[PDB]
Design a protein around this ligand. Structure first.
Ligand SMILES: N#Cc1cnn2c(NCCc3cnc[nH]3)nc(Nc3ccccc3)nc12
Length: 328
């Protein structure tokens, strides 16, 4: 029986309407208020375009969704409305649908993002600390509001490097946290899936996002994208095991009375824990200081209950300069 160590009763104390997303009644806006300027991306759930609000002539992002269940879309809408306004949380501006096809589109604030594949390689040591701190603000905020993002990864972190503005987007996999609830483990992107998802521990919590953040962080300071490069869910756990070691995995499994599938246990085998510094090289040396390793280490723990909370992470000395700078 696992439960969050913080913000566990957020949804218990709030009005039921706050988390009963299925009770939501979507208020559709005017589809003609937004015009497509150009396609900028795509996903398995939608096609994304840069658009313009014809009223104020301001830029926006139009997410045209592929067929989606009513329950599914209400969850994303409710979460966005509940979090709108919070620190670095992308803003949902409008919700519209095509009368004939019934195809819905979500209108979001526009961020002049730079592809992380091109951006990250140019980030200085300080930039990394700064942006990670900014992302942390978003995570502590949503967690404090009883919400798990469940899909933290570079693709879901828009960054306007010129303005140094960051936004956590794509809350389509986000869910409300309720003590004891068993969630679907089929969330997050493979390279950022926490051990709990990989071993089928369903009663996970906000801490899942902290593992994902840890993966992202490791990728940045060690300049290895992604850090844990697994081919499938089974291989993903193996890649993790080969770094953190199997002893820790075994202890984790025994603590939560979890039994790996025979095939998986075979693939994982036995591995010694590899020190973080073994991943240091001339390409990343200017980024792998003791404070960074200490911070990463406290994020990447098998036991989700062991990981730093977003609030704790923000106070880690690794971010002391960012904090001092902010307190000015
Ligand atoms: N919300 C939000 C959100 C806010 N900005 N934003 C941007 N801004 C950059 C637009 C751009 C202009 N030239 C290249 N890209 N892109 C995507 N893209 C996206 C793509 C696939 C899946 C999800 C998001 N999503 C978003």
């Amino acid at each position: 029986m696992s439960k969050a160590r913080v913000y566990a009763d957020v949804n218990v104390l709030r009005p039921k309407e706050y988390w009963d997303y299925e009770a939501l009644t979507v208020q559709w806006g005017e589809q003609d208020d937004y015009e497509v300027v150009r396609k900028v991306g795509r996903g398995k759930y939608s096609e994304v375009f840069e658009g313009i609000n014809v009223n104020n002539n301001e830029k926006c992002i139009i997410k045209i969704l592929k067929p989606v269940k009513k329950k599914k879309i209400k969850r994303e809408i409710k979460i966005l409305q509940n979090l709108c306004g919070g620190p670095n949380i992308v803003k949902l501006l409008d919700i519209v649908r095509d009368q004939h096809s019934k195809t819905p589109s979500l209108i979001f604030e526009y961020v002049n993002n730079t592809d992380f594949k091109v951006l990250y390689p140019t980030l200085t040591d300080y930039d990394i600390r700064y942006y990670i701190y900014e992302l942390l603000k978003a995570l502590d905020y949503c967690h404090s509001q009883g919400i798990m993002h469940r899909d933290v990864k570079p693709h879901n972190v828009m960054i306007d490097h010129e303005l140094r503005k960051l936004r956590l987007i794509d809350w389509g996999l986000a869910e409300f946290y309720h003590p004891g609830k068993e969630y679907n483990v089929r969330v997050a992107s493979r390279y950022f899936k926490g051990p709990e998802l990989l071993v089928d521990l369903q009663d996970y919590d906000y801490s899942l996002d902290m593992w994902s953040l840890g993966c992202m962080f490791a990728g940045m300071i060690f300049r290895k994208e992604p850090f844990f490069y697994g081919h499938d869910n089974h291989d993903q756990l193996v890649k993790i095991a080969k770094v953190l070691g199997t002893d820790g995995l075994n202890a984790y499994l025994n603590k939560y009375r979890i039994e790996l599938d025979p095939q998986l246990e075979a693939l994982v085998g036995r591995h010694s824990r590899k020190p973080w510094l073994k991943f240091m090289n001339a390409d990343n040396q200017h980024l792998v200081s003791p404070e960074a390793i200490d911070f990463l280490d406290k994020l990447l723990r098998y036991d989700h209950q062991e990981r730093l909370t977003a609030l704790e992470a923000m106070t880690h000395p690794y971010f002391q300069q960012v904090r001092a700078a902010e307190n000015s």
